[PDB]
Amino acid sequence: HQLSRADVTTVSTFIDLNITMLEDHEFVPLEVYTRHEIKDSGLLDYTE
């Protein structure tokens, strides 16, 4: 009789190697203090 290849158990001669891509990353703007904060840290503003 004939039979499908799926009827025969499969052994692999291939060596596996799983490489995955480094995914995209988004860098948002990020400051510890803005210019507004730096200017506001003064106690008196001469101009105002």
Next chain:
Amino acid sequence: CIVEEVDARSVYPYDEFVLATGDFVYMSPFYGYREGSHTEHTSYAADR
């Protein structure tokens, strides 16, 4: 006679504060009689 509500601002250690007119008040904003606020700082006599 001028009455003028102003912004006041104080920096640490909060022993004095300024007014928007550029006038220093040589006194803690948190000075008072209760909850230990009588020990914070005052440059002025009691009657003031």
